[PDB]
Amino acid sequence: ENPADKRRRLAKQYLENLKSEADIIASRLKEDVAEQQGRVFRYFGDKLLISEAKQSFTRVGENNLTCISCFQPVLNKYTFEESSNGDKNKGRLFAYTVSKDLQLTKYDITDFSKRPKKLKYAKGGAKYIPTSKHEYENTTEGHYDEILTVAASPDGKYVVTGGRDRKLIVWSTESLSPVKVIPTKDRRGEVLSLAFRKNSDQLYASCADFKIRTYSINQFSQLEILYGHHDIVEDISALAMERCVTVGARDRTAMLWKIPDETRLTFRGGDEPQKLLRRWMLFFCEGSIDVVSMVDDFHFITGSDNGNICLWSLAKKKPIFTERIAHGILPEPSFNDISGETDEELRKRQLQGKKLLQPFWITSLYAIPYSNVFISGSWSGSLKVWKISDNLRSFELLGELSGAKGVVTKIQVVESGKHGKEKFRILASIAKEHRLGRWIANVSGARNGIYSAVIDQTG
Amino acid sequence: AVTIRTRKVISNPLLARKQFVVDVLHPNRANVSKDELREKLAEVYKAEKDAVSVFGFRTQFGGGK
């Protein structure tokens, strides 16, 4: 019973399972290894049924729910063992959420029919303020400032959080107990985004000090700092390989980092309404790029503050396709309050027609790995699902989900069921204020809660 | 933590070997001994330590690499 024979047995059992499920077997085996080849291999936009999605909203006590991260076990083909940390956690789905109230909470989302169920939580406060005042000594167990982000390790053994307290605290998934605190060690190094390399313990951290920090959670140590962004790196995404992508906010530049090659590729939008209007014969100039999600190892999408969703390719520096004002234009300000004049017509002139109108921001944008569908978010009050073309040159609006009401700080997707028939659950964090700050005016009907939508595959 | 990175790898069957450039990232550390680096390269390449050679290592100005 040598170890090799054990691999044989698992594979032989594995092959029997595929035979029981079902030419077909050969294709599935290729699909199992489609991931290493960094190309889209999940064409399921058409078979989605958005109209029949079961939508639900669950209120949460915490103020301004800032981010959500979902962990999904995946069977490892190489060893035929599930990613679950322990036998008790076999086939259990967990979702971790953070808020501005210095509280980390975990939920169980295994039952798609049922709402998220809270399991454990940890809350920080003034008790954790460091007395030393030195950056290297910011090693307190809990948070003392707003927590902005959270990420779950692919092994299911740790969950890591960060925020304006310029610390990177990694917690045990089971008990939410802190095990290591890693200071960023810069005065303005506020953590803004975390992305785990898929099926790896590598972590990429974007900090407000214009740098990206890489960590090895298993070793609980920093590895490298990346330089080249000109403004705060608000978002970060990562896939199986080490090619993470970023966006520079007011820099209006999206950068891809070939960590092995120690080289970086620069992408810039470069759209001007004057040319756009002429070619047509409301167009808003891009102000900042806030979100990014990598659809494919050779493609990625970005969302700007002018409501533009742009598709990118590694070959081309310019966008290959753009979708302008994706979430529409903000409501025009009321005439009765724009000015204090008694006569209404005076107040209307202050509106200046439609010049003051501005578009919704793309606060959230998530693409399922190696798929042809991605989801965008804003405070318009609905989540829009888009399908990318087969040639990966354009995308269209697949559908919409209107259940969510408020700022969609972050979006996540989880899948369950057999390979052929999969049920997708969309989990999106909803907050009354934007995650980074309180600029946004209060939206009518907005509530702090976790939005849940469950979508099925039929054809 | 210390990161070891291999680039410009060229297979040379004439000499029956692998030639490459070593980049060592060693934050908060002076530098890494040739012996330890030989251990790690041997483990990475699944070859005997005796078959791994390293030389010409220069620390970049300002340290850390």
Binding site: - | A1, T3, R5, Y45
Partner: peptide
């Protein structure tokens, strides 16, 4: 006649 068509990758380890 056409010329012959053109034809080891970096590997990483972290320790300590």
């Amino acid at each position: 006649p056409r010329a012959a068509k053109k034809r080891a990758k970096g590997k990483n380890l972290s320790f300590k």
